[PDB]
């Protein structure tokens, strides 16, 4: 998984090479989960929206299994867990955007490139959204171009 929190328990069902999610944690998607270096990149980056949101999901799963929350909502629990879980400056970094400026990120949806011949995947960047709904997929074409090329660079490491 992301190498955070409950050691070797950041797995959905059996994935030992990473973190596997579940549909009830997703919307309009079934059995969408990643693995290998796609999820392990979070420690290297640790400043991107998906990784911060994923940590909260990890924090939720392992705070529901234990802590015996007696319907108290455990709001006292997050009182001093914001620093270790999410990058408080990252949301502050987003704070510089939505004030009548560039399309922003509300942690709603994410995009990634999938290799549909072996099973390779890449860590996602959240879809930038503005007042007028999501972007039309052409505003940041160059952003995916470098990401698509980056896969070829990682393919050299595999080779």
């Amino acid at each position, epitope marked *: 998984g992301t190498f955070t929190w409950t050691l070797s328990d950041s797995e959905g069902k059996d994935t030992p090479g990473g973190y596997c999610l579940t*549909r*009830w944690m997703l*919307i*309009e*998607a*079934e*059995l969408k989960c990643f693995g290998n270096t796609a999820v392990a990149k979070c420690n290297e980056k640790h400043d991107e929206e998906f990784c911060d949101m994923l940590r909260l999901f990890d924090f939720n799963k392992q705070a529901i299994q234990r802590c015996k929350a007696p319907a108290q909502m455990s709001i006292q629990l997050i009182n001093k867990a914001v620093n270790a879980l999410i990058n408080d400056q990252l949301i502050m970094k987003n704070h510089l955007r939505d004030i009548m400026g560039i399309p922003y990120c509300n942690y709603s949806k994410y995009w990634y490139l999938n290799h549909t011949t072996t099973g390779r995947t890449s860590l996602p960047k959240c879809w930038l959204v503005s007042n007028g709904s999501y972007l039309n997929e052409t505003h940041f074409s160059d952003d995916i171009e470098q990401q698509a090329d980056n896969m070829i660079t990682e393919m050299l490491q595999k080779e």
Partner: antibody, heavy 119, light 109 residues
Framework: QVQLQESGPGLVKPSETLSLTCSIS????????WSWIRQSPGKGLEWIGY???????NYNPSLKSRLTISVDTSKNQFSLKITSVTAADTAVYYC?????????????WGQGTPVTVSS | DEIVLTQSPATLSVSPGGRASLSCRAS??????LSWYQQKPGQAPRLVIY???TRATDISPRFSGSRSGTDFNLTISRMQSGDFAVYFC?????????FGQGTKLEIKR
């Protein structure tokens, strides 16, 4: 989100062919479990069948069998082909699928259109 | 290929803001692979509860379900607006994918 529309031959004659055309807009065709469902007055719904990619096309085991549901992977539109229409076949048809991959949801439901047996 | 679907025969009308106890009993081995669907007058049905009793995409938090091996119960805590509609339960452990007769939620006079 996936948007679906359908238009069909409201005029039907007993014991002749019948073909609908469900529409898929803004989404691909492969890796989707397109399904056919109809509702008839006086009886509950019945799962008519599913068409997945080009191979497994199970047609409602032991109930009707002859359904010959086909998918046209050229304009993202699949159709139906009934045989030996009976009086009970008067119903309202719908086409739906799951969360873009799956076989137990049937979330995106189309508008549908009623069909009646007339002579 | 049948799996008897007895879902509160006739009707289960409740007072506004009341509690409903829609049920769907299973006569064959289903386990926890049961989904619920809700259909308004007009339009097409939309799922409400998938899996066993987990709330699906959208859907108000009031909706919930329970599991008892064979006796499956759908519960409404605090109804509001025009929630009066028809409901169905669906089985998907096997591959007949049959549907049930359903039940209509009438409005108290």
């Amino acid at each position: 989100q996936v948007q679906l529309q359908e238009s069909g031959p409201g005029l039907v004659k007993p014991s002749e062919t019948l073909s609908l055309t469900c529409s898929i807009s803004g989404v691909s065709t492969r890796n989707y479990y397109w399904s056919w469902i109809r509702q008839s007055p006086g009886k509950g719904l019945e799962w008519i069948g599913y068409i997945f990619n080009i191979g497994t096309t199970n047609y409602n085991p032991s109930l009707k069998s002859r359904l010959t549901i086909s998918v046209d992977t050229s304009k993202n539109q699949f159709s139906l082909k009934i045989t030996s229409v009976t009086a009970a076949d008067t119903a309202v048809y719908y086409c739906a699928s799951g969360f873009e991959y799956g076989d137990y949801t049937f979330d995106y439901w189309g508008q549908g259109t009623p069909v009646t047996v007339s002579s | 290929d049948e799996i008897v679907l007895t879902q509160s025969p006739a009707t289960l009308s409740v007072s506004p803001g009341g509690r409903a106890s829609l049920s769907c009993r299973a006569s064959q081995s289903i386990g926890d692979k049961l989904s619920w669907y809700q259909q308004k007058p007009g339009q097409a049905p939309r799922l409400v509860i998938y899996g066993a009793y987990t709330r699906a995409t959208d859907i108000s938090p009031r909706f919930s379900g329970s599991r008892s091996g064979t006796d499956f119960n759908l519960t409404i805590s605090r109804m509001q607006s025009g929630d009066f509609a028809v409901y169905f339960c669906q089985q998907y452990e096997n591959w007949p994918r049959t549907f049930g007769q359903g039940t209509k939620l009438e409005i108290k006079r």
